[PDB]
Subunit: 271 residues, 2 copies
């Protein structure tokens, strides 16, 4: 078959563990044709690792979208998007396209811009095939605030699904539990808990981007949403376990570890 065309709308992580770098690397690992519409460029100070986010002008953002839409993506992912304007356009781009899958990683950084959260709820959730919040982001999107348990994650997932997302996976992460990694997946009918072990020498920069990018490529290549999130969780678990130390401040996931090194078991249960 021809390679599936998979677009990410995301920024450049110059360190190359997260951002569009994670997305293109993951798309490559999963035998898709990766494409990116760049939103911003993120750099890091050599001594302190302080981040500098340089937005790209809207005119060049729009030129890239014209090109990507002409090529015709089969699936679109959104990464961290910085403005309500870009959030709104990302949704519009997916609706204009013939893409069948839209995966939204609702990256946020009390939230820094609650305006962006409101924009995600308005413009992206109603279009999303899968939305992939971490525990914090899920509390923001659902309006519940802080989530502390699987039962709280069930409530938030219901609310997010009701806002229009077709499938919701909330990543518990270290915020939920420091010995096991628990995610709550909801399809409108059934709550599934997905669990992987955690490992001592792991590194996690780019994990969220990688998970969402793998989900997108798995969907594009024909996995059901359930199968895609379960396979994506195994994919990123391997990446995290095999992450490596970049400097005193960070270490990226190994995007290629699933294929090159090992698979990690994912336990699936109904909750």
């Amino acid at each position: 078959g021809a390679l599936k065309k998979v677009l990410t709308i995301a920024g450049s992580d110059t360190s190359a563990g997260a951002g569009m770098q994670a997305d293109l690397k993951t798309f490559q690992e999963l035998d898709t044709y990766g494409m990116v519409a760049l939103t911003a460029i993120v750099t890091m100070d050599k001594d302190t690792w302080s981040h500098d986010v340089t937005p790209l002008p809207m005119d060049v953002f729009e030129k890239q979208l014209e090109t990507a839409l002409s090529i015709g993506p089969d699936a679109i992912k959104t990464g961290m998007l910085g403005t309500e304007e870009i959030i709104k356009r990302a949704g519009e781009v997916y609706e204009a396209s013939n893409a069948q899958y839209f995966v939204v990683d609702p990256v946020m950084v009390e939230v820094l811009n609650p305006g962006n959260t409101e924009a995600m709820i308005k413009y992206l959730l109603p279009k999303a095939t899968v939305v992939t919040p971490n525990l914090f982001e899920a509390g923001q999107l659902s309006g519940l605030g802080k989530l502390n348990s699987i039962e709280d994650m069930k409530k938030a997932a219901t609310i997010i699904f009701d806002k229009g997302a077709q499938h919701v996976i909330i990543k518990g992460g270290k915020a939920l539990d420091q010995d096991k990694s628990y995610d709550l997946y909801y399809d409108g009918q059934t709550f599934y808990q997905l669990t992987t072990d955690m490992f001592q020498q792991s590194y996690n920069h780019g994990a969220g981007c990688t998970f969402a990018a793998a989900t997108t490529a798995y969907l594009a290549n024909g996995k059901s949403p359930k199968e895609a999130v379960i396979s994506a969780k195994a994919f990123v678990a391997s990446a995290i376990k095999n992450g490596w130390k970049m400097n005193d401040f960070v270490g990226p996931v190994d995007h290629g570890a699933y294929n090159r090194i090992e698979h990690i078991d994912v336990e699936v249960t109904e909750v």
Copy 2:
């Protein structure tokens, strides 16, 4: 051991077949840790496919370099660079790093009748990049420019160009003959200052080759990083790109990219090697 850290200094090809996209994809296929310092963004009109090159401001270029250099590349590739200033910086970044390998893809545009679009850029490459290069990877046109010989038409002309490019300081030179040299076979000429080798594969379909050059240079870089000799890196890189070209696909009426992952996923192609 640890993944080798491989940096490209290149622009974004929004169509994703060439540019930094080809570089990161190839880096990933070859089990390295790919990185980019972005110079520019190239977009295309939906109707005519006319290109628009949007330079990135020099301050953001510099911020990316600082981050990349802090991380510490094991190898650096240069793709198409738009100005003498960025050509010069690229060479400086390599000197400042602890990278042992520098692969320069000396991308130029021919204006017709063997004339180059930006002659200052060719002078800047000869001045700042050739003397630093582990490998330089010109096509036939570029090699005529870098050597000052103009149009090359034979292996004998290519040998002459290679010796001149070597004398300008490149450690290893590979001149890609392409369709300009022969329509049935893809002949490249490799030189290491001592021996000339002709590398051959079949000339595959010509329709869907977008990103071939970038891919070849990126693969060379990755193979070096991962410990292949320069001769084995270029032979391996030739095989790698040959499968990519053979398995290219039609994107639209104007372009078709190489399949960067074809070597690993689809098939392996033999490279004939002969001393000449």
